Design an enzyme around this catalytic site. Structure first.
Site, PDB file in Angstrom:
ATOM      1  N   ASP A  18     -43.821  13.053  17.167  1.00 20.61           N
ATOM      2  CA  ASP A  18     -43.888  11.610  16.923  1.00 20.61           C
ATOM      3  C   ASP A  18     -45.326  11.078  16.797  1.00 20.61           C
ATOM      4  OD1 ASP A  18     -43.104   8.851  16.561  1.00 20.61           O
ATOM      5  OD2 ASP A  18     -41.300   9.275  17.788  1.00 20.61           O
ATOM      6  N   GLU A  44     -40.979  21.403  12.265  1.00 14.86           N
ATOM      7  CA  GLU A  44     -40.403  22.551  12.972  1.00 14.86           C
ATOM      8  C   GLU A  44     -39.487  22.090  14.117  1.00 14.86           C
ATOM      9  OE1 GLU A  44     -44.802  23.727  14.950  1.00 14.86           O
ATOM     10  OE2 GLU A  44     -43.467  25.317  14.240  1.00 14.86           O
ATOM     11  N   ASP A  57     -48.997   7.493  21.829  1.00 13.80           N
ATOM     12  CA  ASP A  57     -47.626   7.472  22.377  1.00 13.80           C
ATOM     13  C   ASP A  57     -47.270   8.704  23.205  1.00 13.80           C
ATOM     14  OD1 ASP A  57     -45.184   6.194  22.893  1.00 13.80           O
ATOM     15  OD2 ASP A  57     -44.272   6.936  21.042  1.00 13.80           O
ATOM     16  N   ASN A  76     -41.702  12.597  23.885  1.00 21.61           N
ATOM     17  CA  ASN A  76     -42.416  13.045  22.686  1.00 21.61           C
ATOM     18  C   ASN A  76     -43.087  14.411  22.849  1.00 21.61           C
ATOM     19  OD1 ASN A  76     -41.667  10.611  21.552  1.00 21.61           O
ATOM     20  ND2 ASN A  76     -43.715   9.700  21.548  1.00 21.61           N
ATOM     21  N   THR A  81     -45.769   2.784  24.662  1.00 20.84           N
ATOM     22  CA  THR A  81     -44.588   2.628  25.505  1.00 20.84           C
ATOM     23  C   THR A  81     -45.068   1.980  26.804  1.00 20.84           C
ATOM     24  OG1 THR A  81     -43.571   4.606  24.532  1.00 20.84           O
ATOM     25  CG2 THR A  81     -42.593   3.758  26.582  1.00 20.84           C
ATOM     26  N   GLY A 136     -33.179   5.718  16.898  1.00 25.82           N
ATOM     27  CA  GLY A 136     -33.958   4.566  17.344  1.00 25.82           C
ATOM     28  C   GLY A 136     -34.050   3.516  16.258  1.00 25.82           C
ATOM     29  N   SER A 137     -34.514   2.323  16.628  1.00 21.60           N
ATOM     30  CA  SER A 137     -34.917   1.318  15.648  1.00 21.60           C
ATOM     31  C   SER A 137     -35.990   1.923  14.749  1.00 21.60           C
ATOM     32  CB  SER A 137     -35.462   0.063  16.339  1.00 21.60           C
ATOM     33  OG  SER A 137     -34.439  -0.618  17.053  1.00 21.60           O
ATOM     34  N   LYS A 181     -45.770  10.644  26.071  1.00 19.39           N
ATOM     35  CA  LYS A 181     -44.688  10.541  27.053  1.00 19.39           C
ATOM     36  C   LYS A 181     -43.807  11.796  26.961  1.00 19.39           C
ATOM     37  CE  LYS A 181     -42.053   7.577  23.866  1.00 19.39           C
ATOM     38  NZ  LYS A 181     -41.415   6.234  23.717  1.00 19.39           N
ATOM     39  N   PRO A 182     -43.040  12.103  28.029  1.00 22.57           N
ATOM     40  CA  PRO A 182     -42.115  13.232  28.030  1.00 22.57           C
ATOM     41  C   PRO A 182     -41.145  13.267  26.849  1.00 22.57           C
ATOM     42  CG  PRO A 182     -42.249  12.346  30.221  1.00 22.57           C
ATOM     43  CD  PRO A 182     -43.048  11.421  29.337  1.00 22.57           C
ATOM     44  N   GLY A 203     -35.675  21.524  23.465  1.00 20.32           N
ATOM     45  CA  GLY A 203     -35.449  20.106  23.732  1.00 20.32           C
ATOM     46  C   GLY A 203     -36.704  19.405  24.218  1.00 20.32           C
TER      47      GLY A 203
END
Ligand SMILES: NC[C@H](c1ccccc1)c1ccc(Cl)cc1
EC number: 2.7.11.11
Lengths: 20, 337
Positions: free
Chosen positions: B171, B108, B153, B158, B188, B39-40, B155-156, B113
């Site tokens: 994150d 960790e 933040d 993260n 987001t 990412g940026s 969201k799925p 995923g």
């Protein structure tokens, strides 16, 4: 359907955070 | 006794908060395996720690890019908070260090995923499946908020799924220790509370709003407010309207109405009874909150394990050098890192 509209949208991939 | 558990959790946090760990490893101690995300805002690599053979997710930030994005204070927040927190559904920061060019946070590794990947593929989660994850987020926010931390933040993307099928929140780039209110426009778009969009001061209530969005997205397969461009999403969010799939249970619909509530005096999590309004809601009636904290509950889905260093549950990203300048960059900005 709403599902079909989502999948056809440009925001089904990973979404970037925003900022000023 | 949650009150007593949390009092002790704060004592533990405050000690590390006031005297942070610093410079606890070196790049050369790790073997670089694969980029697991970019990412940026930075990148993450699978690495192997030589002295243990342990696999970790190493976040790498370019100091100069951090400065250009005005994320210095946010990056200092992230590392200082992560080294100090301790909770079953938070990704643990094992090491941190810096060199001339980069900042490093070694977390960790969750080979399962991101929730995002599994949710998009499968389409949606059943309500019990969604509930199992939401409960872990309810407990994590209860923990974080008690330490005066706002996460900002959810969201799925993260939320990592571990080898037991449980969640790890990752994150902390916008996480911040704040008593009272704050003003930064961050998050987001799909997950922003209306008060963030409207440039108001806001508080931890924005995380409970985000929980509403997540639960909706998990159970519906798409978020409650979506469009092709952020501006169009913000219009939907502040409109004060939301539509639920016909397959949403009555209890789910009612929980979401109280989470996705524009009126802060009415939003669950933000009322006089705090997180108990959420914990004691009918939708969670079957949830054994202690059993979830203890990880006694059988997970609805366990990711396919193929070794500790398997990257099959992650996408492929273009590999990029880790270059380290011979001149130190941004020394003063990141002195405390
Ligand atoms: N969003 C979590 C994601 C990740 C975390 C840990 C391990 C693999 C992936 C990620 C975090 C940061 C960046 Cl810069 C890209 C991707």
């Amino acid at each position: 359907t709403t599902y079909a509209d989502f999948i056809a949208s440009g925001r089904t991939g990973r979404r970037n955070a925003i900022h000023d | 006794s949650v009150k007593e558990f949390l009092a002790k959790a704060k004592e533990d946090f405050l000690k590390k908060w006031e005297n942070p760990a610093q410079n606890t490893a070196h790049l050369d101690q790790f073997e670089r395996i694969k980029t697991l995300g970019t990412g940026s805002f930075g990148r993450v690599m699978l690495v192997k720690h030589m002295e243990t053979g342990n696999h970790y997710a190493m976040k790498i930030l370019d100091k100069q890019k951090v400065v250009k994005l005005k994320q210095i204070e946010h990056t200092l927040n992230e590392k200082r908070i992560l080294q100090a927190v301790n909770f079953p559904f938070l990704t643990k920061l094992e090491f941190s260090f810096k060199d001339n060019s980069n900042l490093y946070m070694v977390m960790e590794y969750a080979p399962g995923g991101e929730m995002f990947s599994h949710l998009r593929r499968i389409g949606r989660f059943s309500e019990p499946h969604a509930r199992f994850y939401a409960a872990q987020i309810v407990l994590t926010f209860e923990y974080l908020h008690s330490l005066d931390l706002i996460y900002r933040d959810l969201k799925p993307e993260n939320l990592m799924i571990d080898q037991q099928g449980y969640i790890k929140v990752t994150d902390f780039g916008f996480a911040k220790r704040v008593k009272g209110r704050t003003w930064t426009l961050c998050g987001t778009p799909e997950y922003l509370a209306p008060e963030i969009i409207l440039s108001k001061g806001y508080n931890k209530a924005v995380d409970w709003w985000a929980l509403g969005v997540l639960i909706y997205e998990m159970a519906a397969g798409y978020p409650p407010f979506f469009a092709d461009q952020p501006i169009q999403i913000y219009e939907k969010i502040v409109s004060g309207k939301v539509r639920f799939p016909s397959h949403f249970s009555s209890d789910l619909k009612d929980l979401l109405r109280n989470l996705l509530q524009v009126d802060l005096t009415k939003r669950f999590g933000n009322l006089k009874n705090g997180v108990n309004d959420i914990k004691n809601h009918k939708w969670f009636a079957t949830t054994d909150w202690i059993a979830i904290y203890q990880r006694k509950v059988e997970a609805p889905f366990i990711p396919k394990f193929k070794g500790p260093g398997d990257t099959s549950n992650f996408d492929d990203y273009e590999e990029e050098e880790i270059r380290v300048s011979i001149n130190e960059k941004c020394g003063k900005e990141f002195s405390e890192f």
